[PDB]
Amino acid sequence: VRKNPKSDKFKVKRFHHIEFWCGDATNVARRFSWGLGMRFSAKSDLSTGNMVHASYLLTSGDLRFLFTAPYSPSTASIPSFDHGSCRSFFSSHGLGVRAVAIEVEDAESAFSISVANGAIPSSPPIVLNEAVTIAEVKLYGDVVLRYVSYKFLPGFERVEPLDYGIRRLDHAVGNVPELGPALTYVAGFTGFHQFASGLNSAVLASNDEMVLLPINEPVHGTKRKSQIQTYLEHNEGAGLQHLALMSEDIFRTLREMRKRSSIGGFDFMPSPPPTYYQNLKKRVGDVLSDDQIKECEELGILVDRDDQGTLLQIFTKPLGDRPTIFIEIIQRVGCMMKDEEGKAYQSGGCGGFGKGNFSELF
Ligand SMILES: [Fe+2]
Secondary structure: OOOOOOOOOOOOOOEEEEEEEOHHHHHHHHHHHHHHEEEEEEEEEOOOOOOOOEEEEEEEEEEEEEEEEEOOOOOOOOOOOHHHHHHHHHHHOOOEEEEEEOOOOOOHHHHHHHHOOOOEEEEEEEEOOOOOEEEHHHHHHHHEEEEOOOOOOOOOOEEEOOOOOOEEEEEEEEEOOOOOHHHHHHHHHHHOOOOOOOOOEEEOOOOOOOOOOEEEEEOOOOOOOOOHHHHHHHHHEEEEEEEEEEEEEHHHHHHHHHOOOHHHHOOOOOOOOOOHHHHHOOOOOOOHHHHHHHHHHHHHOOEEEEOOOOEEEEEEOOOOOOOOOOOEEEEEEOOEEOOOOOOOEEEOOOOOOOOOOOOOOO
């Protein structure tokens, strides 16, 4: 049990979409659709009227991935987009997340309050066809915290079939040179609270903790070379590290994804040895049955547990050429609570963040 001061400065409903700034929105969006089991939902390319950028939205349950690339400089759906910036971002950082957007009740207001509390402004509020309002502030590095509030986006034409299980964004993570400033800077204008080996982190969270922003900090010292000090060097600075994808069946998902590694999909971190799993049976027993412990071992899932739930997670190697951004698929078993005010659901951060992993290799 921990402390939650529910001190947001604005209403933060839930994670919306993640926007990648590529060099070619087309291939990445294709590669991904195959790899994570996501559907081609919408677009805003030349075929729609856009002559500034190509943008493809792939979805899976509430999870939405947006891929945008710039056209030749010689009418654009996303108003905050501008050539040179998209160019440079990609030229200097490579494939990666440019935007971490979250739903809010009033984007202009959210952006209003945020700016009055130290938030650095990149993009001003913009109402698009009296329907959606979009505003963007600086999170860390060249990643922006995009505010999206409603009455996908205007200008995108709907498209009309994969599904490996992915359902929503659990948490987004960003590595920075110094955890200190970053934390106070983010928590400062948002009003998030602290949810909770060559790295240091803390996790800010929205009121309902259905928005988790874990931030990492490198650790100079005699114990290998900080992986995070490695991300900062190849990514050329602070940038979004990994995205946790919430699946309702991590077994359904890893079967599907792993069957696709050698044919376009994603590769996975080397899995724990058989002694790791043998321990598992007598450590998470009551949560996962034998046939399930055996499935973890076969897909290479890492398990960790705490006072409210159990967590099954795994990790992907870099999504791109640089050992920078990678993906994670997870499942949080436990914490399910059915109240009389609403429907049955599950608290946020259930099981935590597998913190009890690297240790479990006793
Ligand atoms: Fe994570």
